Design a protein around this ligand. Structure first.
Ligand SMILES: CCCCCCCCCCCCCCCCCC(=O)OC[C@H](COP(=O)([O-])OCC(O)COP(=O)([O-])OC[C@@H](COC(=O)CCCCCCCCCCCCCCCCC)OC(=O)CCCCCCCCCCCCCCCCC)OC(=O)CCCCCCCCCCCCCCCCC
Ligand SMILES: CCCCCCCCCCCCCCCCCC(=O)OC[C@H](COP(=O)([O-])OCC(O)COP(=O)([O-])OC[C@@H](COC(=O)CCCCCCCCCCCCCCCCC)OC(=O)CCCCCCCCCCCCCCCCC)OC(=O)CCCCCCCCCCCCCCCCC
Ligand SMILES: CCCCCCCCCCCCCCCCC[C@@H](O)O[C@H](CO[C@H](O)CCCCCCCCCCCCCCC)COP(=O)(O)OCC[N+](C)(C)C
Ligand SMILES: CCCCCCCCCCCCCCCCC[C@@H](O)O[C@H](CO[C@H](O)CCCCCCCCCCCCCCC)COP(=O)(O)OCC[N+](C)(C)C
Ligand SMILES: CCCCCCCC/C=C\CCCCCCCC(=O)OC[C@H](COP(=O)(O)OCCN)OC(=O)CCCCCCC/C=C\CCCCCCCC
Ligand SMILES: CCCCCCCC/C=C\CCCCCCCC(=O)OC[C@H](COP(=O)(O)OCCN)OC(=O)CCCCCCC/C=C\CCCCCCCC
Ligand SMILES: CCCCCCCC/C=C\CCCCCCCC(=O)OC[C@H](COP(=O)(O)OCCN)OC(=O)CCCCCCC/C=C\CCCCCCCC
Ligand SMILES: CCCCCCCC/C=C\CCCCCCCC(=O)O[C@H](COC(=O)CCCCCCC/C=C/CCCCCCCC)COP(=O)(O)OCCN
Lengths: 178, 156, 128, 459, 603
């Protein structure tokens, strides 16, 4: 989610992702914790017997039979965490997420309530105004010629600098705004 | 702020204008493939894979998280067909043909067996229910000026 | 060996069952790298314009306008009378009309005849 | 009838002698007062008509259309106040003059005891609409749209004129009362078939008929908000009113000649409702929905039964109000986002809740939710069609299902989901827009209490 | 003066006052939900009076109070029918809604828009009462569409969630498919009987033809989620648990069945429509119980249970036993509403967890939910002398003692067994074993709102069957004599269901793993019906809507025929006409030609 993606997944990453998926689906099949622990230890053992293979062609012929076997026995109704992209409360609270700029449209009678909040908001806005001018130059000088190759951003280098393009990551609404 | 050169145009014939079209849509020349040059007005527009938006990565930080789209990336011709509100093409645990055979087979069997059960109904070892006054002639339809044939009920 | 999954139009092939990902080449790797480069350049432009405090409007999207223009206004200048196009247009634009005309004409002729013989039982038919 | 015509004419010198910053206020107030005065035409008779003079007469088919026409002008002014802010006083006065002239021509058209006078005013309405579309439209396609909206109309209307004069050369009169009382059957002849076609095609093109509907999406999409409102609410109903008037001389030839138009409408309602499901523009979707509703009205008029006519009148009024409201909602979104692409601005419920309620109620009336007058007209037409032939129920039910589908698709796409992040200029809804929305929607829910006011002369 | 009419109208009228005050100050405070709950409870205790009056005498009314438009010989008026069905169903619905609102005061406490949620619930209740008491077809259609719109609004309660909006549109689509048949029936009745009022429809239809009854059956199948149009009911579990408990469990989904109960005088005169109803109910109950016995979401299991019970109800209708189906509606209301009470309590205590694989030992961890769910499961499966017994046992006896399909009877018995099976599945996987939830335990039942709301429906699920069965007058001849085994068939099949399903569940503890079979996959993916039928038709519609209608015909060929052809022809003719080089030699040559031609042709 947070981390920038790469151009490809290496063989180790594919094997680890298959390991996690197979373990989760085995947990879906093996409801009870003791049965799951036994079968998960067996599953880890079955991964471990080819840990030390040196032939890349052999290792790539493997993981392929393995993912085919996974797709055969994948528990068509796996357990999903409620907040996960398949869960029952995945995007439940998106309707409560209001952008921060909407507060700029509030009536002065509305801003009369909560004066400290809006004073701190003004401070944040001033900080953003200055930091942006610094950030544009820093990103222009740090980016390689011909454009970025990976969507990874640099941190601040000097004392008073702020990380480039920070406003919409720092000012997220909330996980559960209401 | 879009100029005339940035709009879709006619079907490209030469590799030079093919490269120009690929550059226009912000995608590789090797990946660019227009729709076949038929009578349809597809013209110069990329034929992206027919995969739905639902099977795009949900953990990526999209610029449009609900639609799972990025800002400048080319939009599929049938985007409004695949919006996670509509038909999706995600891989299923069972093959499409297997599901079709199973669903069709189950429905056909149930339908066939209902017809068979109509042919061979189930009942109890009883005679018809009897009603006293000429099979309730006056309470069912009436016409009290006709004097229908008397139906006599047997005592057993 | 296990039963094989057969992809379809509406049930596509999984990414982990795709033979193309298991067949790696330097050309494939550079293709992936430059696809990521295009995506990163677009993302950088979007975020640079998105985080700007001076911006007070919709961020113009050329891809969306290209999509809408292709869907609406690019159709006819790219149209050619073709056997496929001509037959499809004739069928899908005439056949339903004549089919429904035949159906309704037959139904109404049957109704009119039955009224002529009087064997319709139009009793209590007051509102029409 | 002059007690309504003269104030509408006086709207012009009052507009042109007004202060530079009082034109909207004066126009709105006096147009509302004219609407209130015109509201007294609704006291109709069970007998013939309200025959004011040799020139003008009122009918319980004409009265609802007249009242809707008078009510539409204040709403059009309120909708136009926003996007005409940066324009000179003379040009704004000219725009208001075009609206007033359109209202005057429509008012005189709906009474119009003479068929030639009806034709003259029915074609005089063409000029103000064309000027409004081709002068105060935004995109470059407006000119093209205007051309379509022109020539289609004339392509239908020029033969009618010939037919009309021909009738008066044979009958001796074109007065509607004399025509109705002295009507005679049309023999099945080629000359009579072509007279029938010349009488029908002019009104068919402006409904519009399914095959002849190309001008409508262009004209409605490229027109300004007042132009779209007047096009969808009143100008589309001129064809229905003309058909309802003119089918009295076309019997019994209508029985045979109605079949191609009946098939075209019954299939085109399905086609246009399906087109609405795949639309990337809000205005185009609303225009195609209008085409579907008018196809249903065409079926009703062609069946020519009492229930058909009542349903057609009710549906014309209800569609006018609902389509005007929908266009106003789309324009409120457009004046903020400047794009008119449905997929761009999303999740507007979280930012504009009251406007979301207005969207919901407009979609509900477009969906024909009972006991709205939309469903009253829908059901009356459907029952009449079922009596005409029991197989129409398949097409009618399919149209109902697709209508609900695309109405809720339009609501969900624009109001629900997640807001677009990069759009930060969505300002709170103005009192003017909310007042406009209420002034559209309260008349509908209040007319459902007294349906006989909009059920026509066969009630 | 004969308070029956005044009180039966005052109930529905006072149900609408909080909707009037929805713009007042109380709607902006936190006392609005309690206000709505109190109003509903007062409505219930006031509607208890016409029930007593009918039970004493059998009193019946038609109240045609307001005359709306008149259509030549057809008069449409606001008329209420206050028969046994209305005066019996209204108190049950009000009691269930009262419990639902008291439960929602605790379940939806953290929702920022709770006043709105309560307002939505009251609007649904009002539309349902309009549907139930309607005397003509137009009023009943008003209620029919109102409950559907309220369902659409309440399913998509969390409008930022894509799946909720998709489910709401799905419900609308299926209910419009049913609406087609509703409108067909209305048009037929108006054209043939000249009325939409029930009295004239019954008087003029001694032998009802196929079209109106088939339209009624299609509408009932759409609204009660029968096999052809079933998936929307399980999909509707996207809404908040109170919405699932009130609308899509006990009150709204029975409406279709209610319609066939309302038109039972015409159903008994038709033989083919009865067979169609019986077969549809049998296949629905079998298929839904089969889907239920393998689900992992608890709300999905209870929704499939609701669908199976609706299928059983329409089986009862198809065997020409409408009053028995109404009684089953009344009992199912109680115990299925309490079942969703318990499910929602479990979900709330375990931090919005709905999967039974993560619900472990709750028999002791939360005991009141445990006992309420045990009682509800016993009432559902059919336990002698409980609320569900007095309906389900008679349903089974009537099906066995009738001239019916053999296949439908077999499927009804199998559905009873599978009902026992999914009940024991829920109990076994949610309450019996070791805990399987995350380590931080936030389990709590100690809130008087939840306890009282559950216990009222608990007392209902224990005693209401006995009370109602002994208080209503007899409306059918009973089955006094039966074979000894055939009287026991319901208990036998239910106990077999418990024993076999429990034995198969106990094998999950074995340290052995195998891959699933074809039948398990078919049961888990719902016969693959939601996959295929939500991918093949929709796509094939939407694609066409862009390829043929939008592009091929509208944007290409309709343009090519009329306008483009005219433009091309006029263009070419203008080019030919105006292209003269300006040489007067050619001009006067044409003049000679025309002059020569003119003299010769005319004379
Ligand atoms: C049911 C009985 C009601 C009795 C009480 C009287 C109610 C009078 C209402 C009159 C019409 C309302 C005006 C429309 C604009 C709304 C104004 C507004 O913005 O609200 C601000 C106000 C303040 O809220 P807020 O917090 O500031 O705003 C936050 C957001 O706006 C968020 O706000 P929200 O989320 O709360 O949504 C606003 C609300 C309100 O917005 C709406 O959607 C209202 C319009 C819905 C109708 C859509 C058109 C379909 C055709 C129906 C025609 C019926 C009209 C009958 C005659 C009316 C006379 C004018 O929408 C809904 O809640 C959805 C309700 C869906 C109802 C569908 C069922 C229709 C048929 C019902 C039966 C009708 C015939 C019965 C025959 C048998 C019995 C005699 O909210 C309200 O006051 C709510 C309005 C009342 C709810 C209306 C629901 C039922 C009323 C139907 C019409 C009258 C029935 C007559 C029978 C009486 C017996
Ligand atoms: C003969 C009556 C026994 C019914 C069949 C029970 C059985 O052996 O299923 C296991 C067996 C294989 O189970 P599996 O593939 O290893 O499931 C993986 C785990 O068990 C995964 O297990 P799970 O925890 O995910 O779900 C457990 C569920 C999953 O098991 C299933 O897949 C159920 C599918 C077939 C059962 C429905 C029968 C209708 O099984 C059950 O809930 C119990 C099955 C229902 C038995 C109780 C009522 C059935 C008796 C009705 C007929 C006899 C009474 C006549 C009254 C008049 O199913 C079959 O071999 C099909 C036999 C009949 C197909 C025709
Ligand atoms: C915010 C939350 C709610 C708060 C408010 C609570 C109160 C709600 C009550 C209001 C709605 C409930 C419906 C109950 C209706 C009661 C009044 C009704 O019965 O009167 C109607 C009367 O009203 C009219 O019939 C309908 C009004 C007509 C609408 C005209 C539109 C206004 C002009 C605007 C311009 C036109 C634009 C559209 C062009 C077509 C019907 O009466 P009717 O039995 O029949 O005869 C009248 C009396 N008689 C017997 C003496 C003759
Ligand atoms: C494109 C978008 C929509 C635009 C509007 C479309 C609607 C226009 C449709 C016109 C309505 C019907 C026209 C003619 C109807 C007459 C009945 C005819 O169809 O049936 C047969 C007619 O036979 C043949 O049709 C004879 C004419 C054959 C030539 C016609 C050309 C066929 C295709 C042309 C269609 C093109 C339409 C657009 C033109 C630009 C019966 O033969 P018969 O019983 O003995 O004679 C009946 C007539 N009598 C009694 C007066 C003598
Ligand atoms: C008749 C129907 C004709 C075909 C209608 C096509 C409509 C196309 C437009 C619909 C809009 C798009 C859409 O609905 O998306 C599909 C949407 C979402 O899919 P989910 O499975 O919920 O995915 C959730 C997880 N992502 O699902 C749907 O609603 C599709 C529903 C289509 C229904 C078609 C099948 C109906 C067949 C019924 C036949 C039986 C009739 C009943 C018999 C009655 C006898 C008494
Ligand atoms: C409120 C507080 C004030 C209390 C004092 C008043 C006490 C009651 C005295 C009222 C006087 C009697 C009265 O109302 O007159 C009758 C009058 C009807 O007018 P009539 O001309 O007599 O007949 C109708 C056709 N012309 O009755 C009324 O209007 C009052 C009650 C009407 C019924 C309630 C209507 C509610 C629903 C609104 C309409 C919904 C849409 C239509 C649905 C169609 C269904 C088929
Ligand atoms: C026999 C004669 C019959 C005469 C019928 C005349 C119908 C009216 C339309 C005539 C169009 C003639 C003009 C023309 O086609 O030129 C092509 C012209 C070139 O563009 P220009 O404006 O000239 O240049 C601007 C850019 N440099 O193309 C266009 O612009 C076309 C735009 C207008 C299209 C309007 C189509 C209206 C026709 C609809 C169908 C009915 C046609 C009328 C006859 C009905 C059948 C009996
Ligand atoms: C949207 C674009 C549509 C363009 C117009 C479509 C309508 C076409 C209708 C016909 C146009 C002219 C009809 C004449 C007007 C009525 C006059 C009349 O009825 O008199 C007839 C005259 O009938 C005619 O002359 C008709 C001749 C038509 C010639 C023009 C043909 C135009 C195209 C024909 C094919 C298409 C017809 C229908 C097209 C519908 C629109 C698509 C009989 O009178 P007499 O002959 O004096 O008495 C009989 C004893 N002698």
């Amino acid at each position: 989610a947070f981390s920038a993606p790469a151009a490809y997944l290496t063989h180790q990453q594919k094997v680890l992702r298959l390991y996690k998926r197979a373990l989760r689906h085995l947990e879906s099949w093996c409801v009870h914790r003791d049965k799951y622990r036994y079968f998960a230890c067996l599953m880890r053992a079955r991964f471990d017997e080819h840990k030390n293979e040196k032939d890349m062609v052999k290792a790539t012929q493997l993981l392929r039979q393995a993912e085919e076997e996974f797709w055969y026995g994948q528990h068509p109704q796996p357990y999903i965490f409620p907040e996960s992209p398949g869960g029952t409360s995945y995007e439940r609270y998106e309707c409560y997420k209001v952008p921060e700029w909407c507060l700029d449209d509030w009536h002065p009678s509305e801003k009369a309530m909560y004066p400290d909040y809006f004073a701190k908001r003004e401070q944040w806005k001033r900080l953003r105004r200055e930091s942006w001018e610094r950030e544009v130059k820093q990103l222009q000088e740090e980016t390689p010629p011909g454009g970025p190759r990976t969507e990874a951003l640099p941190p601040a280098r000097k004392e008073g600098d702020l990380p480039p393009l920070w406003w919409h990551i720092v000012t997220r609404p909330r996980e559960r705004p209401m | 702020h879009v100029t005339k050169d940035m709009f879709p145009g006619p079907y490209p014939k030469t590799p030079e204008e093919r490269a120009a079209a690929a550059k226009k849509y912000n995608m590789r020349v090797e990946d660019y493939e227009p729709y076949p040059d038929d009578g349809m007005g597809y013209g110069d527009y990329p034929k992206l894979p027919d995969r739905s938006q639902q099977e795009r990565d949900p953990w990526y930080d999209w610029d449009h998280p609900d639609l799972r789209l990025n800002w400048g990336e080319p939009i599929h011709w049938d985007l409004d067909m695949y919006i996670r509100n509509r038909v999706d093409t995600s891989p299923t645990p069972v093959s499409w043909n297997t599901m079709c055979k199973h669903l069709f087979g189950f429905v056909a069997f149930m339908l066939f067996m209902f017809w068979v059960g109509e042919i061979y109904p189930s009942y109890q070892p009883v005679g018809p229910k009897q009603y006293p006054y000429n099979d309730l002639y006056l309470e069912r339809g009436g016409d009290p000026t006709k004097e229908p044939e008397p139906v006599v009920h047997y005592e057993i | 060996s296990f039963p094989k999954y057969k992809p379809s139009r509406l049930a596509t092939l999984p990414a982990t069952l795709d033979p193309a990902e298991y067949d790696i080449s330097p050309e494939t790797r550079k293709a992936q790298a430059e696809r990521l480069a295009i995506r990163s350049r677009l993302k950088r432009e979007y975020l640079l314009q998105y985080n700007d405090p001076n911006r007070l409007g919709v961020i113009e999207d050329p891809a969306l306008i290209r999509w809408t223009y292709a869907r609406s206004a690019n159709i006819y200048p790219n149209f050619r009378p073709t056997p496929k196009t001509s037959l499809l247009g004739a069928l899908f634009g005439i056949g339903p009309l004549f089919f429904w005309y035949y159906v309704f004409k037959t139904d109404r002729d049957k109704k009119e005849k039955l009224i002529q013989e009087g064997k319709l039982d139009q009793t209590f038919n007051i509102s029409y | 009838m002059l007690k309504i015509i003269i104030p509408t004419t006086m709207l012009l010198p009052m507009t042109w002698m007004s202060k530079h910053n009082m034109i909207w206020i004066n126009a709105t107030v006096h147009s509302l007062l004219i609407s209130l005065i015109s509201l007294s035409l609704l006291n109709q008779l069970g007998e013939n008509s309200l025959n004011f003079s040799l020139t003008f007469f009122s009918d319980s088919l004409s009265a609802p259309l007249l009242v809707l026409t008078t009510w539409l002008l204040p709403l059009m002014l309120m909708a136009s106040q926003s996007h005409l802010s940066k324009e000179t006083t003379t040009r704004k006065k000219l725009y208001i003059t075009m609206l007033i002239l359109l209202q005057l021509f429509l008012i005189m058209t709906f009474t119009a005891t003479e068929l030639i006078l009806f034709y003259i005013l029915f074609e005089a309405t063409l000029v103000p609409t064309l000027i409004i579309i081709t002068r105060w439209g935004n995109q470059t396609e407006r000119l093209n749209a205007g051309l379509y909206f022109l020539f289609y109309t004339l392509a239908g209307s020029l033969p009618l004129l010939v037919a009309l004069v021909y009738i008066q050369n044979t009958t001796g009169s074109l007065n509607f009362l004399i025509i109705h009382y002295w009507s005679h059957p049309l023999s099945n002849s080629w000359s009579n078939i072509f007279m029938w076609l010349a009488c029908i095609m002019a009104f068919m093109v402006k409904m519009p008929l399914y095959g002849l509907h190309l001008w409508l999406p262009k004209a409605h999409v490229e027109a300004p908000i007042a132009g779209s409102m007047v096009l969808a609410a009143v100008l589309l109903k001129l064809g229905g009113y003309g058909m309802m008037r003119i089918t009295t001389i076309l019997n019994p030839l209508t029985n045979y000649m109605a079949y191609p138009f009946l098939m075209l409408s019954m299939w085109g309602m399905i086609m246009t409702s399906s087109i609405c499901l795949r639309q990337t523009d809000l205005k185009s979707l609303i225009a195609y929905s209008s085409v579907s509703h008018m196809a249903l009205v065409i079926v009703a008029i062609m069946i020519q039964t009492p229930w058909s006519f009542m349903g057609a009148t009710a549906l014309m009024i209800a569609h006018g109000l609902t389509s005007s409201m929908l266009f106003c909602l789309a324009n409120t979104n457009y004046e903020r986002v400047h794009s008119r692409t449905m997929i761009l601005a999303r999740g507007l419920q979280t930012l504009l809740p009251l406007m979301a309620t207005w969207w919901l109620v407009a979609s509900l009336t477009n969906l024909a939710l009972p006991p709205s007058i939309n469903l009253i007209g829908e059901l009356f037409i459907i029952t009449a069609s079922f009596s005409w032939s029991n197989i129409t129920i398949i097409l009618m039910g399919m149209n109902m299902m697709i209508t609900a589908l695309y109405s809720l698709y339009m609501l969900i796409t624009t109001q629900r989901g997640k807001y677009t992040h990069h759009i930060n200029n969505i300002k709170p809804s103005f009192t003017r827009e909310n007042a406009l929305m209420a002034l559209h929607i309260l008349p509908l829910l209040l007319l459902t209490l007294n349906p006989k006011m909009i059920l026509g002369p066969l009630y | 003066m004969n308070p029956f009419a005044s009180l039966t109208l005052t109930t529905l009228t006072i149900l609408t006052i909080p909707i009037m005050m929805s713009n007042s100050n109380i709607y902006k405070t936190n006392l609005y939900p309690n206000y709505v709950k109190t109003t509903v409870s007062y409505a219930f205790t006031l509607s208890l009076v016409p029930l007593l009056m009918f039970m004493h005498t059998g009193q019946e009314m038609i109240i045609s109070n307001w005359h709306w438009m008149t259509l030549q010989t057809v008069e449409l008026s606001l008329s209420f029918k206050m028969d046994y069905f209305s005066v019996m169903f209204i108190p049950v619905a009000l009691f269930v809604t009262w419990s639902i609102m008291e439960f929602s005061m605790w379940y939806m406490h953290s929702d920022p828009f709770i006043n709105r949620f309560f307002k939505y619930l009251l609007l649904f209740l009002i539309t349902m009462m309009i549907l139930v008491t309607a005397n003509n077809l137009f009023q009943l259609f008003i209620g029919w569409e109102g409950v559907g719109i309220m369902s659409f609004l309440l399913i998509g309660w969390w409008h930022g969630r894509t799946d909720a909006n998709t489910a709401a549109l799905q419900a609308i689509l299926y209910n419009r498919i049913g609406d087609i048949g509703f409108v067909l029936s209305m048009a037929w009745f108006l054209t043939h009987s000249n009325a939409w009022d029930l009295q004239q429809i019954f008087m003029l239809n001694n032998e009802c033809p196929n079209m109106p009854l088939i339209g009624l059956l299609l509408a009932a199948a759409g609204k009660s989620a029968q096999f052809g149009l079933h998936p929307w009911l399980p999909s509707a579990m996207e809404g908040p648990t109170p919405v699932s408990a009130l609308l899509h469990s006990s009150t709204m989904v029975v409406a279709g069945v209610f319609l066939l109960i309302r038109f039972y005088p015409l159903m008994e005169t038709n033989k083919l429509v009865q067979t169609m109803t019986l077969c549809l109910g049998a296949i629905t109950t079998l298929f839904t119980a089969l889907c239920a016995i393998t689900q992992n979401d608890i709300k999905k299991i209870v929704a499939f249970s609701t669908s199976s019970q609706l299928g059983l109800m329409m089986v009862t209708i198809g065997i020409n036993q409408p009053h028995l189906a109404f009684l089953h509606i009344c009992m199912h209301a109680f115990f299925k509403a309490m079942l969703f009470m318990c499910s929602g309590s479990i979900i709330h205590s375990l931090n919005d967890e709905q999967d039974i694989r993560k619900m472990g030992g709750l028999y002791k961890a939360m005991p009141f939910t445990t006992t309420a769910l045990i009682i509800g499961s016993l009432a559902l499966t059919g336990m002698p002398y409980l609320t569900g017994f007095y309906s389900k046992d008679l349903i089974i006896e009537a099906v066995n003692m009738s001239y019916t399909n053999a296949w439908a009877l077999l499927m009804t018995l199998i559905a009873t067994s599978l009902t026992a099976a999914y009940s024991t599945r829920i109990i076994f996987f949610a309450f019996l074993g070791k805990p399987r939830f995350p380590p931080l335990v936030l389990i709590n039942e100690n809130n008087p709102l939840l306890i009282n709301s559950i216990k009222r429906l608990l007392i209902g699920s224990i005693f209401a069957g006995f009370i109602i069965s002994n208080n209503i007058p007899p409306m059918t001849v009973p089955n006094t004599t039966m074979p000894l085994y055939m009287k026991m068939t319901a208990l036998i099949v239910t106990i077999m269901g418990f024993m076999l399903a429990l034995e198969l569940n106990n094998t999950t503890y074995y340290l052995k793993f195998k891959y699933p079979s074809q039948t398990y996959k078919f049961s888990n993916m719902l016969g693959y019906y939601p996959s295929i039928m939500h991918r093949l038709p929709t796509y094939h519609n939407l694609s066409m809507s862009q390829k043929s209608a939008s592009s091929l015909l509208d944007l290409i060929w309709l343009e090519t025929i009329l306008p483009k052809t005219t433009s091309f022809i006029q263009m070419k003719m203008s080019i030919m006409v105006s292209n003269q080089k300006g040489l007067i030699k050619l001009y006067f040559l044409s003049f000679l030609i025309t002059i020569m031609i003119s003299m010769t042709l005319f004379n």
